[PDB]
Amino acid sequence: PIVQNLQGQMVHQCISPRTLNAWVKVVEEKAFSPEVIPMFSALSCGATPQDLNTMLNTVGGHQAAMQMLKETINEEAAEWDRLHPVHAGPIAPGQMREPRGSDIAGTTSTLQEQIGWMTHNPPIPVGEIYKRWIILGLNKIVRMYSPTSILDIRQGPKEPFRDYVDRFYKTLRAEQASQEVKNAATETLLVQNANPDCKTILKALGPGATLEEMMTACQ
Amino acid sequence: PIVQNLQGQMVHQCISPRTLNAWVKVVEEKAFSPEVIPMFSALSCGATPQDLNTMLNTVGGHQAAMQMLKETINEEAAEWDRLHPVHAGPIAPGQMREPRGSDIAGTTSTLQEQIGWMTHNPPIPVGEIYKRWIILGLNKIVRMYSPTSILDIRQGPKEPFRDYVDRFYKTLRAEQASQEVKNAATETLLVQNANPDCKTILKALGPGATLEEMMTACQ
Amino acid sequence: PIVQNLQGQMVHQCISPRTLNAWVKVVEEKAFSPEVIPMFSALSCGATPQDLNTMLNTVGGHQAAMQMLKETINEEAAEWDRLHPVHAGPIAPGQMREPRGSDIAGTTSTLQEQIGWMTHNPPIPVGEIYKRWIILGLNKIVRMYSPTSILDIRQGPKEPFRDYVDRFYKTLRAEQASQEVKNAATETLLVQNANPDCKTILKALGPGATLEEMMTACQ
Amino acid sequence: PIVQNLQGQMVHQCISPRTLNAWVKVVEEKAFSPEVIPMFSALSCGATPQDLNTMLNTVGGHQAAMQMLKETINEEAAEWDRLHPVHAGPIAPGQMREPRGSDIAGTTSTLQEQIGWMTHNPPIPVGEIYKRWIILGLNKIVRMYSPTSILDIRQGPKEPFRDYVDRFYKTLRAEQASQEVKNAATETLLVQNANPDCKTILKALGPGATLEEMMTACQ
Amino acid sequence: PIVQNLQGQMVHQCISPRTLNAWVKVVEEKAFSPEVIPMFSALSCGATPQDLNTMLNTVGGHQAAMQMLKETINEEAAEWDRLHPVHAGPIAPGQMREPRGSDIAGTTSTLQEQIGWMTHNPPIPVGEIYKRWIILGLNKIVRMYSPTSILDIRQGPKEPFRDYVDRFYKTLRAEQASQEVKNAATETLLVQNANPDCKTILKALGPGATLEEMMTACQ
Amino acid sequence: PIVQNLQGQMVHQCISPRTLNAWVKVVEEKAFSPEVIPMFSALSCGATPQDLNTMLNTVGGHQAAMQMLKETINEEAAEWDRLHPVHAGPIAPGQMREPRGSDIAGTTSTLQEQIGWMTHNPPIPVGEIYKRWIILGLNKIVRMYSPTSILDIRQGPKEPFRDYVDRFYKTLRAEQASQEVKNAATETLLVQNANPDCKTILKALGPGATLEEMMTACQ
Ligand SMILES: O=C1CN(C(=O)OCc2ccccc2)CCN1
Ligand SMILES: O=C1CN(C(=O)OCc2ccccc2)CCN1
Ligand SMILES: O=C1CN(C(=O)OCc2ccccc2)CCN1
Ligand SMILES: O=C1CN(C(=O)OCc2ccccc2)CCN1
Ligand SMILES: O=C1CN(C(=O)OCc2ccccc2)CCN1
Ligand SMILES: O=C1CN(C(=O)OCc2ccccc2)CCN1
């Protein structure tokens, strides 16, 4: 990653063993549960494209997902190249060349180049641009791997309402519902998919009930 | 988080893998036991709003609680916006814009903006303001999840008085009794809910007994 | 805690995840065995009152003990307020107010105030004063929780003398015997509570025997 | 490894216990699965040739592979010596001698020499040159140890298409297919090796389907 | 402990959680096996008397040994006081008082005093003096706890000579044989206590055989 | 160990708990497998003679080996004293005395002396000299403890050739074959000790086959 030293410089630092192991272990333990993605983002704080590639290449399983992710990266790289074409001439001696999409993805750029871009005044933030592409790809993977439609999350007859709500919102998160839909669902599908005893209570409450008020009402 | 370097500057530092894992693991192990909240506060020392969001987004389960927490945050953000409306014009070039409630919550502000606010002279402490909102929400969750009323904590016939007191005060803490009530309960409900043999001894002690004196009296 | 940086300043540093976890884990594993107290003292090196509260609030069990500890803290705070009353007027602008007992205990003081006191020239050592109150309370807890009187530690007929001595001194430590009594007990209760075969040997040794000499004599 | 200190110098630092243990443990757990190689590269960031030798020499098993790796290193060293012959005379006093292939591999060079080369202006990057040789050797080992031809990865009759794709791409990676072949295989061998029910669906899709589109189609 | 900072000063640093836990865990796992003592010495590098007391007070078991250790410390303190009596008058204002034996042992001295002594030019090395007393006491404990006389270590009829030698030298170490005796024992008790078949071979070797030569001879 | 600080000084630093535990644990887990030796060398990077003694003294088992190692150290110390005799007069006041072999081994030298030698301009590298003696001794131990002659490593009838090669080269390493012999053995004993089916294939290959080519040929 790129860090600041005591002279007030952003400098390169090697990726740590603790970071490397943390990422490998959360993929092994959680696969593509939605919470793996904010974990990835946080573990890759300050990452260069080289570091992001390291993290993704250290994953042993899930090679269908990794191939899909490469396809998404290649799509975003091709859109970058449409928006930001580069000169096809020799580099000005000593000077900084403009990144192509494959330079952002770290496949055609060196670490030294990446450091040069990221520590330019002002930064050409290749690590943050690449991370955005990766996260777009990982969100597609999370949705693909989501096992259950929200339509199929219904409260059991003896299931605590809290347990059902947990299953409902875990499914909405994996299915990639917007925050707008999550906030709105409280007055609609959440009640519909409730068991008859709870449904009666929630129907009786009237409109505008907070989730807290619905959860208190059904115990 | 924001830290001080050797030039006497508060600087940004990436959230550590140890911090990330510590938080995920205490939620997995303790859920919304009351002691998880001071743990959250301590693990989030110096946090930016981005860091606070990372910590909350890394939680995989408990999605009913996480949705309730988002509702509480949105309430406090709307109260901030009532108290501190911002100008709806273009930013003065190079200058610092005033935060709205969604900027404090990190959903409409960048990390660079958050750093600017938190390291202004004097600080606009967006991380501490947001943390206060989060803790308000988490305390509501702890009370919701508290399984047992204090009325239902009564000493068993062969239960050591110490074990009963432990159960009593654990329940009072989850039910969110004030320190005033915790301090006062020693002369009242604690004795009432004691077993007959202890109740006799504690009744005999007279008023003003310290909890230490009650615990010594009943063994 | 408060630490020294490279400009020779004592600065605030966040409590570490390793410190937080170490304390929670020693309470879970050892409860109020006497050795938990020097552990607390060492883990809280440099602590502010805020840090001390964090450590105590992160404890999930043992809520009878935690309530007793709050009572002891409130006693010592009331004695501080008797000895060191503060002015009941507006603060001199920009200047440092004198701490009350609840400021020392971190309930009515901010972190910034605590830093101001602890880094004043010369320090008003609020963290060390509060730690002294806490340790006084924890020692009361250790004595309360000590399961066995020294009178009841007697060597078994086939118990190795070393094993008995270990049980004797572990009990003396939890019962909070002074070092004077620990040093003196070697010539008296330790021998009396020995089994007949050892008692004969130790009686034969004469007075002034070191514990080493008694332990060698009985094997 | 070589790191930068606060005077802006790249300095030597000892290899850490965490790095040493991380490498030993990933070889013990993963052997020569393909993902062990990007792990090696990342754990050896900034390594001197001495550090690279340490890492390889700390491996206890897999001595057939380690002997093969020595053979590959000796081949690349002999090619370096063909391209970059050195003077066979006495060193200019105080001056830096040119590295031979065995100096790059750390067998005939001292640590001080390696530091001199790597911190020259501009660097003679002996650690990076040697790491390239090692990685070439490790990739040969990964291919040798790959257990299964791609021809033999075929979807079972009740095997989820995702599980099959995972097995297909894991095998392609170990067999060291180019990214070109991985990207192209989606329209050809992947479909051929699918079960009849999926094969029908994928045949029906038409050409140019993304892997995401094929995986969605077959569930 | 006392450490050097970047201004070239030895400064106080808090004892780490890793150090605290390392010591507690080696006593739990090894008790007073001889190798616990060099571990203690290394974990207490740079320790103040306060730190040494912390380490010893964090031990929960082994209270017979801890009482014996206090007795040894009190003996060495009384010898220090015989050799180095201090003035029984008021301290020169602002000036450094001379340590008594109980000041070296940290029972009558403050941390600030200990820092003053240890960072004086030249140091009054109270931590190293106290550590020497502690190690003298711990060596007495190791000998007391040694279970077996060297006379009773004899090679079994089917015991590999190496296994016997290991048992012999482990016992010599716990019994606190000098290095002179360890070096000499190879020509004498080691052979005598060997089984008849080995004894014959070692007798046949002649005098002056290295332990390596004896171990090779008997397999 | 000795490290460089920010003023560009090599300074003493305490041995870490992680280093101490790493060494104890690799001896417990691997005993004198050959890979323990490069581990020792790497864990002792920058070590003083005091640190090297700490590491060796922290080993609890294997006391036959530790006594053999002391004998080897004493041999190398006596050779140093033959080559580098020292003056038998009083030290020049304030000046640096020349090390004897027992000073290099840390038995007759203080830490301060060792620091003085190792940080002299130019260094008298006592830690590196002593480490060389220790490694010479440890290599003798590894050979002594090697359980099996290379003559006795022969491929089983159903043993994969790779598994056999692994056993062959693990044995050659413990028996301390030179790299020359390891490289040459591929054309000779490795083939001879192969099973008949592999032997036929390897015989058919002709001379000069790489180990990779032999391993591919036999599967
Ligand atoms: O075709 C490619 C090659 N890429 C690659 O191998 O990057 C590392 C990576 C990326 C995604 C998954 C696993 C590892 C970059 C993007 N596109
Ligand atoms: O609607 C919203 C969106 N928020 C959000 O997603 O923040 C992170 C978070 C917050 C609470 C729980 C889990 C994660 C911010 C507040 N309100
Ligand atoms: O009534 C009070 C409130 N206190 C409090 O809550 O402090 C933290 C704490 C203290 C003791 C035990 C558990 C946590 C401070 C002292 N007295
Ligand atoms: O013959 C050699 C000797 N080498 C060697 O021993 O290096 C360390 C190493 C290298 C590969 C595998 C295990 C350990 C360097 C290259 N060629
Ligand atoms: O009587 C005393 C009191 N001492 C003491 O308590 O020190 C800490 C310690 C020392 C030895 C064992 C356990 C803990 C110092 C020496 N003599
Ligand atoms: O006789 C000696 C004494 N030595 C010694 O005790 O050093 C530490 C050590 C060395 C080897 C094995 C275990 C511990 C130094 C060398 N010769």
Distance of alpha carbon B82 from alpha carbon B101, whole angstroms: 9
Give the type of residue at B61: G
Query: Under an 8 A CB cutoff, do D15 and F183 touch?
Result: no
How many structural domains does chain F have? 2
Tell me which chain A residues have a C-beta less than 8 angstroms from the C-beta of D122. Answer: none
For residues A71 and D211, is the Cβ–Cβ distance under 8 A?
A: yes
Q: SS3 for A75?
A: helix
Q: Is the CB of B190 under 6 A from ligand 2?
A: no
For residues D59 and F162, is the Cβ–Cβ distance under 8 A?
A: no
Distance of alpha carbon C33 from alpha carbon C44, whole angstroms: 18
Q: SS3 for A215?
A: helix
Q: Can you tell me which residue has the tokens 């007795």?
A: E71
For residues E133 and E73, is the Cβ–Cβ distance under 8 A?
A: yes
Tell me which chain E residues have a C-beta less than 8 angstroms from the C-beta of F6. Answer: 6
For residues E80 and E87, is the Cβ–Cβ distance under 8 A?
A: no
Q: How far is CA F116 from CA F10, F108, F153, in A?
A: 11, 14, 50
Distance of alpha carbon C80 from alpha carbon C76, whole angstroms: 6
User: Cα angle vertex A171, ends A170, A172, to 5°?
Assistant: 95
F33 CA from centroid of ligand 6 (Å):
21
Distance of alpha carbon C112 from alpha carbon F145, whole angstroms: 63
Q: Is the CB of D69 under 6 A from ligand 4?
A: yes
Residue of C11, C62, C71 with shortest CB distance to B210: C71
Note down the domain range covering F190: 150-219
Distance of alpha carbon C180 from alpha carbon C63, whole angstroms: 33
* φ, ψ dihedrals at D4, nearest 5°: -100, 135
Query: Quick one: D121 and D167 in the same domain?
Result: no
For residues C128 and C108, is the Cβ–Cβ distance under 8 A?
A: no
- D97 torsion bin: left (phi>0), alpha (psi -120 to 50), beta (else): beta
Query: Under an 8 A CB cutoff, do A212 and B144 touch?
Result: yes
* φ, ψ dihedrals at A160, nearest 5°: -55, 140
Query: Under an 8 A CB cutoff, do A67 and D182 touch?
Result: yes
Query: Quick one: E140 and E202 in the same domain?
Result: no
Cα within 13 Å of Cα(E204), Cβ side: 8
Which helix or strand (DSSP H or E) is residue C12 part of?
Answer: strand C10-12
The residues, any chain, with a CB within 8 Å of residue E204's CB and separated by 6 or more, are none
Neighbours of A85 (CB within 10 A): 10
Tell me which chain D residues have a C-beta less than 8 angstroms from the C-beta of F18. Answer: 16-18
* Closest CA relative to residue C162, chosen from E146, E62, E32: E62
For residues E215 and E161, is the Cβ–Cβ distance under 8 A?
A: yes
Cα within 13 Å of Cα(F219), Cβ side: 11
CATH assignment of the domain containing C46: 1.10.375.10
For residues F77 and F85, is the Cβ–Cβ distance under 8 A?
A: no
- What 3 state SS string does chain B have? CEEECCCCCEEECCCCHHHHHHHHHHHHHHCCCCCHHHHHHHHCCCCCHHHHHHHHHCCCCCHHHHHHHHHHHHHHHHHHHHHCCCCCCCCCCCCCCCCCHHHHCCCCCCHHHHHHHHCCCCCCCHHHHHHHHHHHHHHHHHHHHCCCCHHHCCCCCCCCHHHHHHHHHHHHHHHCCCHHHHHHHHHCHHHHCCCHHHHHHHHHHCCCCCHHHHHHHCC
Q: Is the CB of B138 under 6 A from ligand 2?
A: no
Q: How far is CA B202 from CA B161, C65, C144, F156, in A?
A: 11, 18, 17, 81
- What 3 state SS string does chain F have? CEEECCCCCEEECCCCHHHHHHHHHHHHHHCCCCCHHHHHHHHCCCCCHHHHHHHHHCCCCCHHHHHHHHHHHHHHHHHHHHHCCCCCCCCCCCCCCCCCHHHHCCCCCCHHHHHHHHCCCCCCCHHHHHHHHHHHHHHHHHHHHCCCCHHHCCCCCCCCHHHHHHHHHHHHHHHCCCHHHHHHHHHCHHHHCCCHHHHHHHHHHCCCCCHHHHHHHCC
Alpha helices, DSSP H only, in A92-192? 101-104, 111-118, 126-145, 161-175, 179-184, 189-192
Token digits of residue B185: 């309960």
For residues F212 and D140, is the Cβ–Cβ distance under 8 A?
A: yes
* Closest CA relative to residue D167, chosen from D158, D176, D178, D154: D154
Distance of alpha carbon F172 from alpha carbon B45, whole angstroms: 55
Give the type of residue at E154: R
For residues E120 and E44, is the Cβ–Cβ distance under 8 A?
A: no
Atom of ligand 3 nearest to the CA of C106: 15
Query: Quick one: D164 and D112 in the same domain?
Result: no
* φ, ψ dihedrals at F4, nearest 5°: -100, 135
Query: Quick one: C76 and C89 in the same domain?
Result: yes
How many A/B residue pairs have CB atoms within 8 Å?
81
Query: Quick one: F136 and F28 in the same domain?
Result: yes
Q: Is the CB of D179 under 6 A from ligand 1?
A: yes
Query: Under an 8 A CB cutoff, do A166 and B64 touch?
Result: yes
CATH assignment of the domain containing D168: 1.10.1200.30
Tell me which chain F residues have a C-beta less than 8 angstroms from the C-beta of E8. Answer: 7, 9
> Closest Cα to atom 7, ligand 4: which residue?
D53
The residues, any chain, with a CB within 8 Å of residue E54's CB and separated by 6 or more, are C38, C41, C42, E15, E20
Chains contacting chain A through 3 or more C-beta pairs under 8 A: B, D
> Closest Cα to atom 8, ligand 4: which residue?
D53
For residues E114 and E27, is the Cβ–Cβ distance under 8 A?
A: no
Residue of B12, B54, B62 with shortest CB distance to A166: B62
The residues, any chain, with a CB within 8 Å of residue E145's CB and separated by 6 or more, are E31, E32, E65, E174
* Closest CA relative to residue B87, chosen from B77, B96, B75, B76: B96
Q: What is the DSSP string of E135-191?
A: HHHHHHHHHHH----GGG----TT--HHHHHHHHHHHHHHHT--HHHHHHGGGTHHH
Q: Ligand 2: which of B69, B70, B114, B129 to mutate, judged by most atoms within 8 Å of the beta carbon?
A: B70
The residues, any chain, with a CB within 8 Å of residue A154's CB and separated by 6 or more, are A164, A193, A194, A195
Q: Is the CB of A138 under 6 A from ligand 1?
A: no
Query: Quick one: A29 and A131 in the same domain?
Result: yes
Q: Last residue of some domain: D94, D128, D149?
A: D149
* Closest CA relative to residue E40, chosen from D132, A82, F57: F57
Atom of ligand 2 nearest to the CA of B137: 11
Token digits of residue E180: 């002179």
Distance of alpha carbon A108 from alpha carbon A130, whole angstroms: 13
Residue of A6, A64, A66 with shortest CB distance to D215: A64
Query: Quick one: E31 and E9 in the same domain?
Result: yes
Chains contacting chain B through 3 or more C-beta pairs under 8 A: A, C
For residues D119 and D10, is the Cβ–Cβ distance under 8 A?
A: yes
Query: Quick one: B124 and B205 in the same domain?
Result: no
Tell me which chain C residues have a C-beta less than 8 angstroms from the C-beta of E59. Answer: 35
Annotated resolution, angstroms: 1.4
Query: Quick one: B1 and B109 in the same domain?
Result: yes
**Interhelix angle F49-57/F111-118, nearest 10 degrees:** 130
The residues, any chain, with a CB within 8 Å of residue D14's CB and separated by 6 or more, are F1, F3, F42, F45, F46
- C4 torsion bin: left (phi>0), alpha (psi -120 to 50), beta (else): beta
Q: Which residues partner with A4 through β-bridges?
A: A10
Distance of alpha carbon A154 from alpha carbon A137, whole angstroms: 30
Distance of alpha carbon E135 from alpha carbon E142, whole angstroms: 10
Asked if residue B147 has a cis previous peptide bond (ω within 30° of 0), the answer is: no
Chains contacting chain E through 3 or more C-beta pairs under 8 A: C, F
Give the type of residue at A29: E
Distance of alpha carbon C198 from alpha carbon C215, whole angstroms: 10
Q: Ligand 6: which of F52, F68, F70, F131 to mutate, judged by most atoms within 8 Å of the beta carbon?
A: F70
Query: Quick one: F161 and F125 in the same domain?
Result: no
Q: SS3 for D126?
A: helix
* φ, ψ dihedrals at E158, nearest 5°: -120, 15
Token digits of residue E166: 């290991």
> Closest Cα to atom 7, ligand 6: which residue?
F53
Distance of alpha carbon B43 from alpha carbon B20, whole angstroms: 9
Asked if residue D85 has a cis previous peptide bond (ω within 30° of 0), the answer is: no
* Closest CA relative to residue D62, chosen from C61, A7, B112, F166: F166
Distance of alpha carbon A132 from alpha carbon A41, whole angstroms: 9
Query: Under an 8 A CB cutoff, do F45 and D15 touch?
Result: yes
- C206 torsion bin: left (phi>0), alpha (psi -120 to 50), beta (else): left
- E94 torsion bin: left (phi>0), alpha (psi -120 to 50), beta (else): left
For residues D123 and D46, is the Cβ–Cβ distance under 8 A?
A: no
Query: Quick one: A58 and A20 in the same domain?
Result: yes
B141 CA from centroid of ligand 2 (Å):
15
Distance of alpha carbon C198 from alpha carbon B110, whole angstroms: 76
> Closest Cα to atom 11, ligand 4: which residue?
D70
Distance of alpha carbon D146 from alpha carbon E198, whole angstroms: 50
Distance of alpha carbon D217 from alpha carbon D199, whole angstroms: 10
Token digits of residue A9: 């410089």
Query: Quick one: C122 and C144 in the same domain?
Result: yes
Distance of alpha carbon C13 from alpha carbon B212, whole angstroms: 36
* Closest CA relative to residue C202, chosen from C183, C218, C181: C218
Cα within 13 Å of Cα(C182), Cβ side: 24
Which helix or strand (DSSP H or E) is residue E131 part of?
Answer: helix E126-145
**Rg of chain C taking only CA atoms, in angstroms:** 23
Query: Under an 8 A CB cutoff, do A215 and B15 touch?
Result: no
Distance of alpha carbon D169 from alpha carbon C70, whole angstroms: 61
Distance of alpha carbon E23 from alpha carbon E18, whole angstroms: 9
Which ligand lies nearest to the CA atom of residue A109 in the structure? Answer: 1
Q: Is the CB of D214 under 6 A from ligand 4?
A: no
Q: Which residues partner with D10 through β-bridges?
A: D4
Q: Last residue of some domain: B91, B125, B149?
A: B149
Query: Under an 8 A CB cutoff, do F42 and D54 touch?
Result: yes
Query: Under an 8 A CB cutoff, do F70 and E179 touch?
Result: yes
Distance of alpha carbon A89 from alpha carbon A96, whole angstroms: 13
The sign of the torsion formed by the CA atoms of A75, A77, A82, A87 equals negative
C70 CA from centroid of ligand 3 (Å):
5
Distance of alpha carbon A125 from alpha carbon A44, whole angstroms: 14
For residues B17 and A22, is the Cβ–Cβ distance under 8 A?
A: yes
Distance of alpha carbon E163 from alpha carbon E171, whole angstroms: 12
Q: Last residue of some domain: D149, D174, D209?
A: D149
Q: Ligand 5: which of E32, E53, E62 to mutate, judged by most atoms within 8 Å of the beta carbon?
A: E53
* Nearest-neighbour CA in chain A from D125: distance (Å): 13
Distance of alpha carbon F26 from alpha carbon A51, whole angstroms: 30
Distance of alpha carbon A104 from alpha carbon A125, whole angstroms: 9
Tell me which chain D residues have a C-beta less than 8 angstroms from the C-beta of F8. Answer: 7, 9
Question: In this structure, which long-range contacts are made by residues F214-219, counting pairs with CB atoms below 8 Å and at least 24 apart in sequence?
Answer: F214/F161, F214/F186, F214/F190, F215/D64, F215/D68, F215/D144, F215/F161, F215/F162, F215/F165, F216/D144, F218/F161, F218/F194, F219/F160, F219/F161, F219/F162
Tell me which chain F residues have a C-beta less than 8 angstroms from the C-beta of E3. Answer: 14
Q: How far is CA F42 from CA B199, C168, D127, F22, F178, in A?
A: 67, 46, 17, 11, 22
How many E/F residue pairs have CB atoms within 8 Å?
81
* Closest CA relative to residue B194, chosen from B151, B161, B148, B147: B161
The residues, any chain, with a CB within 8 Å of residue F65's CB and separated by 6 or more, are F32, F141, F144, F145
